[PDB]
Amino acid sequence: VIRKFTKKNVARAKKKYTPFSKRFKSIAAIPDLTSLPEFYGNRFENKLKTTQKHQIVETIFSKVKKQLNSSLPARENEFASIYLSAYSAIESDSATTIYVAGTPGVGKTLTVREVVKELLSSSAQREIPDFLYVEINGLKMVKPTDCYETLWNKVSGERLTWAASMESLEFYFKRVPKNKKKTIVVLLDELDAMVTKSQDIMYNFFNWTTYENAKLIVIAVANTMDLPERQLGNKITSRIGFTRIMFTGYTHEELKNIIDLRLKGLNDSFFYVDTKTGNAILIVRKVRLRMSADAIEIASRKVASVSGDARRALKVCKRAAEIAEKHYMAKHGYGYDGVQTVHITHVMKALNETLNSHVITFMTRLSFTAKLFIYALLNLMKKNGSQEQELGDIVDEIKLLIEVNGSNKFVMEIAKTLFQQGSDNISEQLRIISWDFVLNQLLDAGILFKQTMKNDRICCVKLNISVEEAKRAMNEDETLRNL
Amino acid sequence: SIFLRTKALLQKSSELGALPARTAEYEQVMNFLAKAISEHRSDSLYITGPPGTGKTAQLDMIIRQKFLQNLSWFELPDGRLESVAVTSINCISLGEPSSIFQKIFDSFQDLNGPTLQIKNMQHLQKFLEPYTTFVVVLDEMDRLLHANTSETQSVRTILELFLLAKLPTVSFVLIGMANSGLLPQTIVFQPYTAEQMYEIVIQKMSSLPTIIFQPMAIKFAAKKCAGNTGDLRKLFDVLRGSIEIYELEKKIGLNYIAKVFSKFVNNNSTRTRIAKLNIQQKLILCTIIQSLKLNSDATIDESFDHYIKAITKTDTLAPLQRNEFLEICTILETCGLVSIKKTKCKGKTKRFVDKIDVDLDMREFYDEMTKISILKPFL
């Protein structure tokens, strides 16, 4: 047959369509699912392995940088609340929802994972019954319904399509008796990412916690405390509940304790450093490593002022150690193959490059034509105050600025280059040389905005950057500030 | 432990002929069945209400107490015997709203027999014709509407079900519960009051040997949780949080309810947010809100531009740069005074850009920076 179009790259999974409600004849026909070899969890790692032919030189700051990587001193009350709710709901065989919200990097996922680890340790001591832990991250899903595919695959071991998985989970949570079940603890991380238009997924996940036979713990980690009030309906907000756990950004003393806990064994300690290569061994010269308490304190105070984000504090300390290690390796010439201190200067330089703006020094290093464009644009904003200027007006005002300051030395040397490219055989041009080039360059830089128009004269252009930093970059130039 | 079982009873997933504080509505719903199974007349019932009012709980209570798969017996007011088939279906947990007829058929037919393929009104209408009463309870009937389409096609499935529960030569009685001459009967479930919530709580904890709450604490929790448009789920979480707060420190007193209602309300308090700021950060906050006053859709760059010109008009507190301006804006967003969002312009150049907005009351702002009483003209 002759097709009207073709779909030649269809990749379909081997997922069955029949839900769990048709797996046995009756409710009484359902066996004990705990004594089943595929329920409740009853190969790629070696492809990224090779043989090492050299000996990596780990310098003395490499252990500091390794210990400062992201891979519970400040979360006691949050840990205790989450653990007590989960322990009470597991040991009494009930279903509940715990809500956790906070800004990035305040220890939400780490605290919930530690709670789950301690509950698994308590279930290994036969103090609470066994449970299955499932982690669903909404930003790791391709489609939002794939969470239905994930959770059911973690429960039964089957692979169904998402609608059949949703019916299977509904039948499982509602109809299967508690004597044939295991408790499930589900972490719904990045809860805002699973919010869709119809909000059926959110309703189903929080409504399964209201069923009497469910034995389901849903720990929902969010980014805002008012997500059910802003984005969800009244039905899902009623099911989530009034009790919500806020993870506040860290104060500077807790960030100080976090950084000291990552460096408890390294700070104020001695290393055997081999001066031939640079390789350092933690307990040939005996060198003491030190990072200043003033440096850690000022980085922690800065980070707690900004966000209270532990990732940022660890990254600022790691960047300071990297800067100091770069200077040390440069001054000794070591390569990769008596007191070494990472100081408050390195911490301030790590804190400054994140706060430095390149926009002004980008604009001060442009050519004369791009600066002339920006200067004429600012002149037109001063003349009429419209904040959007047509490109033809910019052309006319560039021409005006050339013919008005014609007695200037630099302008009377630049005019032949601008309008004829220094050639007698080239006619006088309506645009300057490199007009399109500097227009497109300022558009790709994000300095400029241009409307989608086909007439080149009446097309409007807007500053995307702030006006005063453009004026500062214009007054930096010698020629433009004199005319 | 008494604390564990009391915490178990006050979950949203705990069950308990009539529920407490609902018996009259129970009788109303029962009166529906007291006709429908009596005269073999197909009829349709609509139930509304705000969330947590006991619709699903009372219907499941009725199904578990007083009632080819899922066949059982029901007694009328005279009460001889009657063969009934009772199921319950949540409409949101289905794939498509058009398959619900098939779902009803997969809720009724014996698994050993021939499983037919069902599309619409007609095949279900032909299937129930040789028969025995069929009780269907459909939770969330409103999500049976199609959120797309229009008014003509969103009310296809619901009108089809209402017509199929109204015509003769079948025995189809339909109960539908949504949230708040053949039109359905309506009982509005009402939000609970403080006395109703109190009686529900003592009825639920009557299975417990002791009561580890003072009754004044339950009454205070009920009167704060009821208000207007109350939900019993909120009262359950308040009492459960009181137990958790009590055992995280060590009968439950009056104070622990207030400790719950101080722990889980944000307590915005713009004055104490402002008092944690610096004088420079207060100056940037004043310039930001003045820029929002006079521009009404201002990006961060125009706000910084206004800040530069406004504090060069004063010639005190020498100015800072744009990136550290954004840094103090981030401090203000961390404090809870400023929201930065990513939106589109309304100009000829429509592109994305970062916009700045406030969520603070003007009276506390103006009072707290007139109490500063040195740097005036930014207010």
Ligand SMILES: Nc1ncnc2c1ncn2[C@@H]1O[C@H](COP(=O)(O)OP(=O)(O)OP(=O)(O)O)[C@@H](O)[C@H]1O
């Ligand atoms: N209390 C802490 N003690 C030690 N390290 C911590 C602590 N809190 C956070 N960290 C570090 O910061 C990292 C970020 O924490 P986490 O993943 O829990 O953040 P989050 O709140 O879930 O953030 P996001 O919303 O971005 O996912 C942790 O992996 C850990 O390296």
Ligand SMILES: Nc1ncnc2c1ncn2[C@@H]1O[C@H](COP(=O)(O)OP(=O)(O)OP(=O)(O)O)[C@@H](O)[C@H]1O
């Ligand atoms: N009168 C009552 N006695 C005992 N428990 C009750 C009573 N009313 C409600 N509950 C409990 O309240 C919770 C929610 O009740 P239910 O599911 O019936 O609410 P609903 O009105 O259907 O709400 P929604 O619109 O949110 O679905 C359940 O735990 C239920 O046991």
Ligand SMILES: [Mg+2]
């Ligand atoms: Mg996280």
Ligand SMILES: [Mg+2]
């Ligand atoms: Mg309900």
